[PDB]
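$ run holo --ligand "2-acetamido-2-deoxy-beta-D-glucopyranose" --emit tokens
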Amino acid sequence: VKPLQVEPPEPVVAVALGASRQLTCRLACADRGASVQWRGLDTSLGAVQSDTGRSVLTVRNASLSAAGTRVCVGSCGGRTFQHTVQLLVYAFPNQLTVSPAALVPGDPEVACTAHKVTPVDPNALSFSLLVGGQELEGAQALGPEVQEEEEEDVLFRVTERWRLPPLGTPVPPALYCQATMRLPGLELSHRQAIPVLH
Ligand SMILES: *[C@@H]1O[C@H](CO)[C@@H](O)[C@H](O)[C@H]1NC(C)=O
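-- output --
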């Protein structure tokens, strides 16, 4: 095993807005002046270096400013070791709004808005329009519209819209909007019912 080890070891660690995470950097060293440094936001909270074999970095009540690349550097007997890990701070939406909130057969469009979300990158944040547990075939996605929420941290409001196909017979009792967020080691989802009236 390498002299320097970080737990957790993954190159990207995701932390929710308001949550906590602890990164422990351990350096095995027989010599006396072994040093462990946590840095990466040196222009900000700053770098911290100690004569030690163990240094723990803790993010508490994570804010978006906690995000960024951290590096643990260990020095033992003139040799230097490192581990680089990106902290990703995200906010999964705490509310979806569907418009219209209920559909009548024949309605041509439905919109689903995710509130207070970040990141908005479509490679992480996705929207699906389902009937049963399957994607509704023929639903044309008009593309996410992104805006800031009103005024730490600035979060976003993201709306997907679909032109609807005929819903067919038998008419489904509901559609569902699902917002899904995919990050390293994580898949988060929010499915909201859309009643179909009449
Ligand atoms: C967490 O952070 C926010 C500031 O963004 C603060 O308003 C809230 O009270 C904090 N919670 C604690 C425990 O300090």
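-- notes --
The pocket of 2-acetamido-2-deoxy-beta-D-glucopyranose is lined by residues 61, 63, 152 (CB under 6 Å).
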